[PDB]
Amino acid sequence: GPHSLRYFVTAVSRPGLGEPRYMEVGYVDDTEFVRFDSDAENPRYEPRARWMEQEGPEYWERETQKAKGNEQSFRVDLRTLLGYYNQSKGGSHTIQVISGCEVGSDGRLLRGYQQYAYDGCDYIALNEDLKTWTAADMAALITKHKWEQAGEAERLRAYLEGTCVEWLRRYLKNGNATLLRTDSPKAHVTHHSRPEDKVTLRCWALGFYPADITLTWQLNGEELIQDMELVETRPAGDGTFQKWASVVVPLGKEQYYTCHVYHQGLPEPLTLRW
Amino acid sequence: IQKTPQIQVYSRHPPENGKPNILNCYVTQFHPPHIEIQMLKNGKKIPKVEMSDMSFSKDWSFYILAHTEFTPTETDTYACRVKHDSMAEPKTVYWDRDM
Amino acid sequence: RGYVYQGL
């Protein structure tokens, strides 16, 4: 199936409390695999996935040097944006970036992307054509021009189509046992009483990987999507995810409702009842 | 942008007293990123707590996971206390083992 | 492998 290499970057200024905090967190699909935190006792790029032990010392030194270079670059960016927006030096501000590429099952690039945000709002983004930028405001229009004159889009395209793709393939290979596995979810239903002769039936799905899953409740064969409670799929601390979906039904009518779980680790979907 | 965090507390496996497990506190959809997360066992702060799985959603709000290993007992209670500027009083969410 | 970002 498709796979992706994504980096979530954050730069937050802490006026009065010293230098801003800088963080890089990398992901291959739903798995965190590398991280850098400027607040760390010893700021170094560190592995977050066991399979990353296959990379030599030179890998960690290079990535650490780049991250520190990025830290300095974003320190300046925070100052620059105060100018663009005419903001005072005393406030805390945030720059967020999501950068990455995705390859199909055969390892060829499907798409590459890069998007910036300032204080929680879109700032500038690379367009699907990987050649042009789109600014969310006049400030971003300043950056757009700078980048066009520096030929930045070409440099980024080189990375997205090259480095990003090749390293993504490499990570998928070295960590294939972890990244290409499939953990089948284990599901169960809980019952909770409520006032006015009604009950809450909750359908739980635990220990699955990849994170993609579909949990639905049905009555008369119709899926009750509109009348359904649900949490976003969440990591459970060991590389797997969980999710639950609930429905409040009339007391004594619980047996007319079934929970269905669809996941790639299930040849046939699970059907549960209380 | 200021967004109040959604705090979810849950274990890796259905709790079984005496069996090791992992307690999770997923703090999601918040902004700005400044936040203090504490996991508590019987009202006392737990030291060995790992932070991971940080990400942003499409609206740019933050998601972070705080987790620690633990072996449930019938008399031990757990909770996650979160301090964030979008709130005046810190919020404590208890682990509901009957959820 | 991360990218070396350009300044804004």
Side-chain angles (χ1 to χ4, degrees):
Chain A
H3 295 292
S4 63
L5 169 54
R6 288 172 301 148
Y7 285 90
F8 297 80
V9 173
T10 320
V12 198
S13 64
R14 308 179 283 200
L17 314 185
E19 299 277 24
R21 185 161 177 184
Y22 182 74
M23 296 189 68
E24 296 190 14
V25 182
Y27 286 81
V28 173
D29 298 345
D30 303 316
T31 296
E32 186 184 355
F33 84 110
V34 286
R35 182 174 72 191
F36 178 87
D37 185 350
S38 69
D39 264 14
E41 307 70 29
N42 177 15
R44 295 284 300 178
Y45 231 96
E46 58 172 33
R48 308 285 288 143
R50 175 68 173 260
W51 48 270
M52 278 309 289
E53 65 162 321
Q54 300 183 56
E55 296 301 335
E58 59 294 317
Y59 177 91
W60 305 104
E61 183 54 19
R62 274 189 171 249
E63 293 300 285
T64 294
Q65 293 326 303
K66 296 199 300 190
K68 289 200 172 306
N70 283 340
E71 190 185 350
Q72 297 316 109
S73 205
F74 284 82
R75 287 192 189 181
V76 175
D77 285 355
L78 288 164
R79 186 193 199 284
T80 304
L81 295 182
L82 286 184
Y84 292 0
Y85 291 99
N86 207 87
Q87 291 162 321
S88 59
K89 282 200 169 188
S92 172
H93 295 286
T94 314
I95 294 178
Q96 285 163 268
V97 191
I98 304 192
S99 218
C101 54
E102 305 184 353
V103 297
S105 309
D106 58 355
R108 293 170 74 75
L109 177 77
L110 288 178
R111 68 177 188 119
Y113 41 89
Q114 185 166 258
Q115 295 157 202
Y116 283 78
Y118 184 51
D119 291 336
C121 292
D122 294 12
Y123 184 76
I124 198 168
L126 180 69
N127 289 320
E128 300 77 15
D129 76 329
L130 305 186
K131 298 179 304 299
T132 60
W133 310 93
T134 183
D137 59 30
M138 289 180 71
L141 210 41
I142 304 177
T143 303
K144 186 178 186 296
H145 301 329
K146 283 185 183 187
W147 287 1
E148 289 172 338
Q149 275 205 263
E152 176 61 23
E154 176 158 51
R155 186 181 68 105
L156 178 61
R157 193 170 57 253
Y159 166 79
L160 300 172
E161 299 191 331
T163 305
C164 196
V165 170
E166 298 176 1
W167 280 87
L168 168 50
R169 287 176 188 151
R170 173 182 171 82
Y171 298 143
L172 282 172
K173 185 179 77 186
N174 294 350
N176 77 318
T178 296
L179 302 171
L180 309 187
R181 81 187 195 278
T182 288
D183 293 330
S184 310
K186 287 192 181 178
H188 71 270
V189 180
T190 60
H191 198 255
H192 303 279
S193 302
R194 297 172 69 101
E196 203 197 330
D197 298 68
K198 291 160 192 167
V199 304
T200 295
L201 294 171
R202 195 183 309 287
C203 191
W204 288 91
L206 320 175
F208 60 85
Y209 187 87
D212 185 56
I213 190 171
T214 298
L215 262 186
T216 68
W217 275 98
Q218 291 184 349
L219 172 70
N220 304 314
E222 64 205 292
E223 305 197 313
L224 318 171
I225 269 59
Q226 178 182 273
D227 325 82
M228 198 167 78
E229 167 91 280
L230 194 94
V231 291
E232 297 173 291
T233 308
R234 52 200 196 186
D238 62 358
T240 63
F241 305 79
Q242 64 160 227
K243 191 188 187 70
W244 62 255
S246 59
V247 67
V248 178
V249 313
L251 181 48
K253 189 194 177 192
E254 291 85 284
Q255 287 304 332
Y256 297 3
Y257 300 69
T258 56
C259 178
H260 302 264
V261 188
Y262 307 80
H263 184 80
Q264 60 182 65
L266 293 179
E268 290 157 334
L270 296 177
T271 303
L272 293 76
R273 287 164 159 278
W274 182 48
Chain B
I1 293 305
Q2 188 189 55
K3 291 179 179 176
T4 299
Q6 301 295 284
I7 303 137
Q8 305 166 64
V9 186
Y10 52 94
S11 49
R12 165 61 181 84
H13 313 267
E16 304 176 287
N17 293 333
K19 312 262 192 56
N21 205 333
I22 297 175
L23 185 57
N24 296 282
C25 180
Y26 201 32
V27 185
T28 65
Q29 297 154 11
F30 63 92
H31 217 291
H34 316 277
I35 202 167
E36 193 197 322
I37 303 171
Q38 306 180 270
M39 296 196 79
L40 316 152
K41 173 183 180 169
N42 292 319
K44 197 168 194 59
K45 187 202 183 314
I46 297 170
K48 177 186 179 294
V49 170
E50 298 163 53
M51 303 283 266
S52 67
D53 295 277
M54 191 206 94
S55 56
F56 325 139
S57 44
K58 297 186 188 68
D59 72 340
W60 301 106
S61 65
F62 291 84
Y63 285 52
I64 184 63
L65 180 66
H67 57 106
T68 186
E69 300 164 88
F70 83 116
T71 290
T73 296
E74 209 60 88
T75 70
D76 283 345
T77 65
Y78 292 85
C80 189
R81 183 170 61 212
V82 178
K83 302 191 195 67
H84 187 254
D85 313 86
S86 65
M87 313 185 287
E89 310 277 337
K91 184 163 171 58
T92 300
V93 174
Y94 281 88
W95 176 43
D96 177 2
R97 63 155 76 194
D98 293 336
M99 192 190 279
Chain C
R1 231 187 184 186
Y3 184 66
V4 172
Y5 303 86
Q6 184 60 267
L8 304 185

